[PDB]
Design a protein around this ligand. Structure first.
Ligand SMILES: Nc1ncnc2c1ncn2[C@@H]1O[C@H](COP(=O)(O)OP(=O)(O)OP(O)(O)=S)[C@@H](O)[C@H]1O
Ligand SMILES: Nc1ncnc2c1ncn2[C@@H]1O[C@H](COP(=O)(O)OP(=O)(O)OP(O)(O)=S)[C@@H](O)[C@H]1O
Ligand SMILES: [Mg+2]
Ligand SMILES: [Mg+2]
Lengths: 440, 456
């Protein structure tokens, strides 16, 4: 504890020797004084450029929070010393950091070298971040990330990626959220695509992905879950759940899984959300989510979508459907979703088509790779197969389930055999299996 | 503290040098002395005309609140100095401002130049306000302001403008608030017109415009949100949300958006609100909002209104009638159950589906918006041939209205723009012109811009 006080006193007195001795002895570089200032901070206010430099080289943090709450950069600007401001900025100081009073390094000092340094640091940071992010996106676009997991559905991936890129590059109106409606048969990756998109946007934030299941909303009064009860009713003080989640992460990705299962008057609450990204809870607080992304998944027109997809498979063949027939898909949606204004607010309608033979083979290969890696990681068993296995597994495909049919087929026909053999201790650790078309 | 006291003493002592030095240092000009007066106050009371002038030049407020609570104009009047009163009035002092005891500068003053200055200031304020407001309204009418943002809907613009202008010029009954109901198909500017009207009435004040998404009132019990819970119930200490909002701005513009999505027993709360502008919160406090403007929006009769736009198809040479409004009524009563609710609305405004020229105008407006955004953000100049709008309008969907055009333009132009921008094929200051095929191509001032490949 004495080391921190000694370092603070040395920094206040501009004692280079004492500051260096304390730092080399393990003294807290960001030591805090009882008055609320640190060694780097009091060095900054006292125009101790050398002390500030040595403290920064020792690991001083200039962004740590009357001048109460003013950081090291704030005090450097207060002294109107440009050398200290430049050194702190080179050390990672934020030129726009704020104190308890809200003052910033860009306000304390008069126009001059300090302002120039702060502005240049801010501009260079912003430009570097912009260029780096753009280059990263170019190098590894969203489409490749989705293709890592999603198989087929090229049109849907292209549409979603185009919309997302248009949003990220700033070429989007901020007055209206972006809304998607995923349509297609069951078990073809709609909610999977939504999950992948949410992960891409908010990879390191669970709060960034808000999931709803509209099976849990199959009656009119279920709207009270979204915004909570009005004043004087049970649960009022709680407030809306969806409103809470949106307030936590305004730019999150909201997924209304199986929206078709909602009562139609539950969708009415979505009008303001989809138009202006505005929603009011039971307490009257209004949530602004203009930059959020809304995804709705349903299979309302599944049969018609499959029939259309046959168009590609109806070709004389001597892949991409124009799908102007959406004019006759609209009546189905209107019949289910009874309000035209609801559909009008949807930016894009994404159609997922049934898998082709090659896509089915790819799915089977994906499943067998997953199982092989699981076996290697768990029991250290190598697992291998040929075309005959993929084709035999595909032959058991069911249209009504898609990827789920493939999963069940692989599990039943192959995984059961691996489990039975393992339980019989016929699989020594490190051994290799070929599935030599093990059938019938 | 020390600087404020020094400035106050200098103002009291008529010390020009001290007052100037303290003002230059940064002493608060409106600092309050322990006796209740400020620097300007005591400069006025001591007949320090020059000190009053210099304090006003420094930013002194003459209208700031036995001379307890007296304002600088009050002190100048009490000093019997006409110069101080004149200078304070020139600084915006109110001749009718009241002190703690309720005496105005026109009261304490002795007959003379003080009366002249105060009365001249008051009359000038009133007449200048009236004349300037009238001149601005005539020069730039609300109807011309709306036309900048709303395409078509001439009959709605004309009705709303006529009612608004009627209210502003005082030719309205103050007992009953003005109520509008907006009817028509989806995405044809109802809420847009409401927003523009609110912005016009209250230039920027957020409290001047009140939103209410009636879609959140699908059950009777939700009406409690208007007025709050009764005594003894959770949330009672908070009053009615709408009551609070209206109290903060009695003459606000209230928008009950999607009123047809409310439970019809919830609309019952609006009977007194629309008839007399009275609403009593859960705590028994009544809100007076007789001068507010209420706007409702719905698409209740929208098939029947859009079907009556077959009058555009009648081509007699080769707009809604009273008798149509008596076919649109049965539909209104079937939805909004009560004749006493409908009989409270001042005007029913009908918004019609766009004709082909209005679609072209909408497409041009959207393209102009995007061009302005591009030019401002990246200095990119954007141009389009006349045929671009013709191609784009084909994406129009009568069921969705303008937002269909919005989405079409976005999807099939802005996507290419963003793809090119990310590809860095749009150098700053470059000129980009859209050309017309069955699809849309972009030329970078002459050569065709090569479409990037996201899939690589
Ligand atoms: N196109 C796909 N490519 C790879 N895996 C997929 C694909 N689609 C689905 N899956 C996987 O198969 C499962 C199906 O999940 P979903 O994606 O959620 O199905 P769903 O289409 O979304 O439709 P429902 O809710 O049954 S209607 C998931 O386990 C996915 O991981
Ligand atoms: N003349 C116009 N008519 C309709 N929309 C316009 C017009 N000019 C601009 N717009 C824009 O097109 C969109 C139309 O949406 P809204 O203003 O909400 O119309 P609406 O009458 O309220 O349709 P509903 O009942 O909510 S489905 C708005 O975002 C407007 O800004
Ligand atoms: Mg699903
Ligand atoms: Mg609307």
């Amino acid at each position: 504890s004495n080391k921190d006080a000694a370092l603070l006193e040395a920094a206040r007195a501009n004692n280079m020797q004492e500051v260096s001795r304390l730092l080399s002895e393990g003294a807290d570089v960001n030591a805090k004084h009882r008055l609320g200032w640190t060694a780097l901070m009091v060095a900054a206010i006292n125009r101790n450029n050398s002390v500030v430099q040595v403290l920064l080289a020792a690991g001083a943090d200039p962004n740590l929070g009357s001048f109460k709450g003013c950081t090291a950069l704030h005090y450097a600007v207060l002294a109107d010393d440009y050398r200290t401001v430049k050194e702190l900025l080179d050390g990672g100081a934020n030129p726009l950091q704020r104190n308890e009073m809200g003052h910033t390094p860009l306000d304390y000092a008069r126009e001059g070298e300090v302002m120039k340094l702060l502005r240049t640091s801010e501009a260079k940071y912003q430009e570097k971040q912009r260029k780096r992010e753009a280059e990263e996106r170019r190098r590894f676009p969203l489409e490749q990330r989705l293709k890592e997991h999603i198989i087929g559905q090229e049109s849907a991936i292209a549409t979603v990626g185009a919309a997302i890129r248009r949003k990220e590059n700033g070429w989007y109106d901020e007055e209206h959220p972006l809304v998607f409606l995923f349509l297609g048969s069951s078990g073809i990756g709609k909610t999977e695509l939504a999950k992948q998109t949410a992960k891409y946007m908010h990879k390191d934030a669970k709060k960034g992905f808000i999931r709803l299941d509209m099976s849990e909303f199959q009656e009119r009064h279920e709207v009270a879950k979204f915004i909570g009860s009005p004043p004087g009713y049970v649960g009022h003080e709680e407030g809306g759940q969806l409103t809470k989640k949106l307030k936590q992460c305004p730019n999150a990705v909201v997924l209304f899984d199986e929206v078709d299962k909602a009562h139609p008057d539950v969708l009415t609450i979505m009008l303001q959300l989809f138009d202006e990204g505005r929603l009011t809870d039971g307490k009257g607080k209004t949530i602004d989510c203009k930059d959020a992304i809304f995804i709705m998944t349903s299979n309302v027109a599944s049969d018609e979508i499959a029939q259309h997809a046959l168009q590609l498979r109806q070709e004389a063949l001597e892949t991409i459907s124009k799908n102007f027939k959406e004019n006759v898909i609209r009546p189905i949606l209107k019949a289910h979703f009874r309000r035209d204004e609801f559909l009008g607010r949807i930016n894009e309608i994404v159609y997922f088509l049934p898998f082709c033979h090659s896509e089915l083979i790819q799915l089977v290969n994906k499943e067998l790779n997953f199982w092989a890696k699981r076996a290697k990681q768990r029991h250290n068993i190598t697992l291998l197969w040929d075309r005959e296995v993929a084709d035999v597994l595909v032959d058991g495909y069911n249209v009504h389930y898609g990827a789920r049919s493939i999963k069940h087929e692989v599990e039943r026909r192959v995984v059961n055999q691996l489990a039975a053999a393992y339980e019989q201790d016929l699989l020594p650790g490190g051994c290799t299996l070929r599935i030599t078309v093990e059938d019938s």
